[PDB]
C-alpha cells in the first residue's frame, strides 16, 4: 500500500542521532553558537 508505505517511510528516518555522542554534542554546540552569534552580534562606530 502506498499510504502506509509513505507513513512508515516518514517515521523510519534516523535523521540525526546516527552519529556518535561526542559528535552529536559537538554538532549541537556549534549550532547554538552560530545562532547566538548572529542574534547578539554588535558593531559600533569608529569614532564613538
Amino acid at each position: 500500500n502506498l499510504t502506509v508505505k509513505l507513513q512508515l517511510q516518514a517515521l523510519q528516518q534516523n535523521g540525526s542521532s546516527v552519529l556518535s555522542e561526542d559528535k552529536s554534542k559537538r554538532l549541537n554546540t556549534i549550532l547554538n553558537t552560530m545562532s547566538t552569534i548572529y542574534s547578539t552580534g554588535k558593531v559600533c562606530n569608529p569614532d564613538n
Partner: protein, 49 residues
C-alpha cells in the same frame, strides 16, 4: 566577544574577588588598553585649557 563587561558591576568585582593570576592580568590590562587609550587625546587638551 559578545560578553562585554562594565567597570562598576563586574570589573572591579573580578579584581576584588578573584585569585587567578591570568584573569586579574587580563582585566587590569584591558581596562587600560581599551578605555585609557581614549582619554589621552582628551586629557592633553584639557590640561591646556
Amino acid at each position: 566577544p559578545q560578553e562585554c563587561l562594565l567597570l562598576e558591576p563586574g570589573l572591579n568585582e573580578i579584581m576584588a574577588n578573584s585569585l587567578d593570576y591570568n584573569e586579574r592580568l587580563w582585566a587590569w590590562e584591558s581596562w587600560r588598553s581599551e578605555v585609557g587609550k581614549q582619554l589621552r587625546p582628551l586629557y592633553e587638551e584639557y590640561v591646556v585649557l
